Design a protein around this nucleic acid. Structure first.
Ligand SMILES: O=c1ccn([C@@H]2O[C@H](COP(=O)(O)OP(=O)(O)O[C@H]3O[C@H](CO)[C@@H](O)[C@H](O)[C@H]3O)[C@@H](O)[C@H]2O)c(=O)[nH]1
Length: 394
DNA sequence: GATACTAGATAG
């Protein structure tokens, strides 16, 4: 019921993945709804995927370790301070020290909002100041009431009344993407299967490799996996002697899209570039197989980008089973969504589906629309940020 | 003790 000043703060730094995407998507919504916004991030630690999204023209970097004043001056110039990430466990005494001093000098007329974007305790543990950050917050959000942040970490800090933790969904303006990359069914290459994600076990990269060597490759299809970095978690792909063809983001045009080829792995990607390639690929894959406890209503940005750019979304079954439609709590697998639920113990019925859609384009374009409208209903900004804006205000 | 989950050093 009035225009406010917002400061989005990422103390971990600008990593270029989910948290960075949420902030940018948060900034756009606030701006579109009449509010002034400033996006601030700590550059004490740097990241590879720092340019995946375009923020360079408006984001404001700051070195907490040696710019406390500018930092304090920025975080105090708003009505709502939203912290999406906290210093990592490797920043250096000065950084985590000044960040803690910042939380002690945020004027009284500022409502501090804290979003916890991680899932597993293992990730939650690599945070510094997360406890102080949470106690200073006037509002807290998490991906699941039954996730680790809620059931374990909030138990360690509040064994005199524990703050409420509201649930949220990482929203995105789906229409902007569609209206920008969607293509006519004729421009799509039904033989290019494109997987996107990062090198982490719950991201289902293994099953994509398996699915390619056993179904797509043998059938003349081509597979591209975008976003795999040789993180330590990559050693396992070495031990498992899994066939592949790595490509740096510079030599993308030397990638071989012909049949009878191993999984073509792309290092890391620029988000707008990936969407363009995806909007012209027959099927996009996002096999996140997170566990029941961590799943409530939150789909991931990689999930939403697939629906939004005009491809046929191929997600992990269990995921769509545990998650619930935002409109009526019903499982995502209970709707005629057009989505193709991936079954690990039945990759043949999955492949068969892809084959059908691969033959007649009428049904294909009939399934996109249903998938798009379904993902729109479930997680577009228009709805989700308004839900959060209301919890933050009242 | 089995098992998920979590880019860096350095030279051009
Ligand atoms: O090299 C890359 C890799 C990813 N992306 C993009 O980065 C975002 C990644 O977000 P998401 O798909 O959510 O994956 P995570 O990086 O795992 O995001 C984390 O943060 C999100 C915000 O809440 C949560 O939804 C996730 O579960 C959590 O893992 C997407 O827009 C991707 O298109 C790029 O542009 N380039």
């Amino acid at each position: 019921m009035g225009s406010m000043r917002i400061c989005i703060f990422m103390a971990r730094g600008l990593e270029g993945c989910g948290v960075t995407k949420f902030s940018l998507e948060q900034r756009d919504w606030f701006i579109k709804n009449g509010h002034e916004v400033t996006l601030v991030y700590a550059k004490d630690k740097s990241f590879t995927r720092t340019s995946s999204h375009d923020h360079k023209s408006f984001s404001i970097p700051v070195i907490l370790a040696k710019e406390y004043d500018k930092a304090l001056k920025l975080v105090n110039d708003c009505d709502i301070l939203i912290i999406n990430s906290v210093p990592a466990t490797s920043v250096q005494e000065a950084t985590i020290n000044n960040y803690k001093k910042l939380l002690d000098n945020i004027k009284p007329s500022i409502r501090v909002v804290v979003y916890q974007h991680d899932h597993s305790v293992l990730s939650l543990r690599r945070n510094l100041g997360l406890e102080e950050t949470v106690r200073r917050a006037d509002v807290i959000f998490s991906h699941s009431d039954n996730g680790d942040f809620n059931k374990v970490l909030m138990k360690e800090w509040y064994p005199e009344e524990a703050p409420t933790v509201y649930n949220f969904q990482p929203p995105m303006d789906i229409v902007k993407v569609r209206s920008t990359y969607w293509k006519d069914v004729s421009e799509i290459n039904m033989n290019i299967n494109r997987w996107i994600g990062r090198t982490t076990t719950w991201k289902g990269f293994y099953q994509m490799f398996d699915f390619h060597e056993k179904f797509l490759k043998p059938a003349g299809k081509s597979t591209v996996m975008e976003g795999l970095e040789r993180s330590p978690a990559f050693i396992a792909i070495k031990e498992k002697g899994i066939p592949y063809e790595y490509y740096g983001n510079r030599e993308i045009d030397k990638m071989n899209l012909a049949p009878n080829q191993p999984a073509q792995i792309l290092d890391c990607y620029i988000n707008s570039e990936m969407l363009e390639r995806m909007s012209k690929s027959g099927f996009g894959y996002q096999l996140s197989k997170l566990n029941q406890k961590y799943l409530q209503r939150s789909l991931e940005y990689t999930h939403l980008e697939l629906g939004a750019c005009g491809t046929i979304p191929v997600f992990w079954k269990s995921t769509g089973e545990n998650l619930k439609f935002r409109v009526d709590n019903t499982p995502l697998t209970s709707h005629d969504s057009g989505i193709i639920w991936f079954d690990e113990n039945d990759m043949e019925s999955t492949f068969e589906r892809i084959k059908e859609l691969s033959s007649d384009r009428a049904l294909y374009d009939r399934e996109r629309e249903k998938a798009y409208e379904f993902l729109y209903q479930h997680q577009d900004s228009s709805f989700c940020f308004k839900e959060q804006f209301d919890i933050i205000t009242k």
